[model samples]
Target: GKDLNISLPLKTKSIAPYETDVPVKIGAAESLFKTNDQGKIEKALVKSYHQPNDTTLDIELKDNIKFQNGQKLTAEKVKSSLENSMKKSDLVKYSLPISSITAKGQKLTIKTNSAYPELVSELANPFMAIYDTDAKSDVNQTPVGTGPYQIKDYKQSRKISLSNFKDYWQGKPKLDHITVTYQEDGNNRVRNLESQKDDLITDVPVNKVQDIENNQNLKVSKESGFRTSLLMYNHTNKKMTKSVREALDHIIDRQGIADHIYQGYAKPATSPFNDKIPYIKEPKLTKQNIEQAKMLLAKDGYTKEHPLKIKLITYDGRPELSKIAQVLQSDAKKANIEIDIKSVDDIEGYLKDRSAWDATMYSFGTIPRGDTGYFFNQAYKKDGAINKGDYNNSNVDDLINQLNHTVDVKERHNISNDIIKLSSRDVPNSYIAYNDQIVAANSKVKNYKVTPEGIYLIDYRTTIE
Candidate 1:
């Protein structure tokens, strides 16, 4: 059998190594805290205070760990590396908000911006991985991390080579080397896995699950995914003005979309606070009906004489988004609402240009936690860089703020539930399918499961190589 696909959105610029792109370095290197197979976290590269609610974090640098460029990780050098990231991109915004970095002895303390619950989880992002300061030059295009494998060679859009690190903190990797490649098409990726071209794959594409099962020699490993999909409305558009907005809200058929469009792959979205997590209440989006929408529009003088013309924008990321848009377009026709579909190259750019499109079909991303305040807040609170829809609801904003500060996880979940219900009240962006992460892999590849959020790590260090 072949290996699974590991495709990602084509990056315009090489991601800076110091910025979380150091997985190979990290797998070979070490961190102060690390997550295990059971999702329990423990100390590795650094150590922390012992108190139950201690806010201060101290990272104890391994005196033995060395960068591929041959330099030790010292508190002072790390401080410099952290600062250097600011000069590279806006990533400095993430770390700087936490606290000022200070180094007195061998330890460095990272204070919190607030009692961020997932601070440790955030550390797992490649952007926060550590690097040897001496090898800092051009690490984005080159991988010089202290990861389990050193980069022997890399060809953009093709593959990269990793040589096992003899001094890896966990011990030498079983494999002498590994070659990681990218696959754009998920189907082809699964096909490769079935052919054994690749050792393993993550994210078994839900649509192709049946086809993968036919591969007698391959096994598909499944895990509960935490990712949920939500939509945003362009509240600023004329077609969405107060009265018309109310009319449009009446047109959404969330239940139908969930049942028919998704073919039961996803649960009917209830609210933002994950159902698995405590404090989250389940609230469903209202059902859809043509007559109800038409009546609502008539009440506001939206008749055949006064038709609403709206332009919706969506990308080809999810194969189903475009199909969903077409269904919405057909349904709107029955209401005498004129809909125009526009495809764009730059989705982020289109969002910023508010006047260009009246609405959008967006696949909202949320991390599973009570403290999903950051991602939610990014959608619309105020002056949010990603708030492309220009949606501003004071009450919704207030709810978000309350959820963010309600350290009691349960209360925060309730607040999040209310916000989801409120946001879906008016068909902002029709909540579409929650894209599933599907993959096929040879069972021999070990110590790997797609991470809670969706990442593929196949090193065969402890697996049946």
Candidate 2:
């Protein structure tokens, strides 16, 4: 009935904002399959899935589904889309345990390299969203998908707009149009909200949460998500021994940082798994112990005369990360540790050049898919696709490999605990805090829903009253 405009903290980084035919906003193109609220894979374009053996998964596609180009959805199209993704998508090639994909008649069969219980869970990743097989090869310029909303216009790192698809299979969207503007500055976004320049804004800073909540016209919504703010060590460096890593972990003031920076919006992380996930125990955590940290360093042959000097690297992509690094630097001085903070523009390049720094301060959703398999494969596995810090352990690798083949829920629970236990004992990455997302919406916006994974493609269901 009405149009809505919103502001976000970061601009779309990818050339193609929609369509999985390349690699951006794959989940937003929810034509084939979608993950449900419970994080279970549900049929969207898919009709059903059958497993004849541990190594094989057969998927049946719904026949009546249609793409934006008005082409009929078919098993053959799904096969081609997946094949293109396998070759082009590093996320698919690395996280998915599939060996080959083939289609015949109305069924698409996937052959896995081994028994993968989480194949469906893996497909829920945005990287695996399906698009029209015969769509244009250059999806960046033109995004064509079967989603309820189609891209109307986009200016790289500036703005995006979408119009409701009249013939959407789910039914035409409630809202007629949606426009989004990119504003990286949190304060400016709130100002836009106050000025009525935008109906909704995301990523409100912790310092500004109270001011927004006080406004009668504006309301703030938040959700505790799987996003983690942490520090990763470079295992390739000889100086970063297990003792040294543990010592550094002991020196971290997780409570102080969370309370000071997050302003009650976050929780201090004591284990690899965040508090949101149930059925796991955490190690007994205490306030930062400078003496214990010093003793651990001394045990590792580091003394005041030969103080452990480390170059800590971070980026400015997230406004709070640089401040967090500075906080760590101040805390590290008490233990006679020298932290040289180096801020870089290109995080991907800096991570690739591993020898440039001893460790990096970074943040990401450790388990965005709501499956432990994603974190195990991408962060801990030796050849993990995004394992840029070079954290390797035969025992951890053993547990990960075992977790891959083990599918039973009970057994998976045990293996998950084992992995978490090892992480606490070994301290590959110092757990800092779990993150919460803040979104401000005008009182006129109705049916706004916030999820841990974030809001995407839900604009159709949202209405401006």
Compose the digit string of candidate 2's lDDT tens values, residues 1-465: 487877765455453422222122311256355555555567777788889899998999876667666776677877877676667656677767678888886688989878888887767666666667577545554455666666666676677677776666666667777777777677788889989889888777788888888998889988887777788888888999988888888888888878898877788987766876886667666468988988989987777778889889986545567778898788777887889999876665677777898988877667766667788788887757667787878898898889888988888878988888886787888878887878788888876656676534253467787
Worst 10 residues of 2 by lDDT: 18-27
RMSD values, in order shown:
4.4, 3.1
TM-score of 1: 0.78
Error of 1 at 338 (Å): 4.4
The global C-alpha lDDT for each of the candidates, from Candidate 1 onward, is: 0.57, 0.73
What lDDT tens digits, residue by residue, belong to model 1 across residues 349-380?
A: 56777778877766544552224665556565
- Quick one: how many clashes does candidate 1 have? 31
- Assess the local accuracy of residue 255 in candidate 1 as a C-alpha lDDT between 0 and 100: 62
Error of 1 at 112 (Å): 4.8
What C-alpha root-mean-square deviation, in Å, does candidate 1 show against the real structure?
Answer: 4.4
lDDT of residue 233 for candidate 1: 62
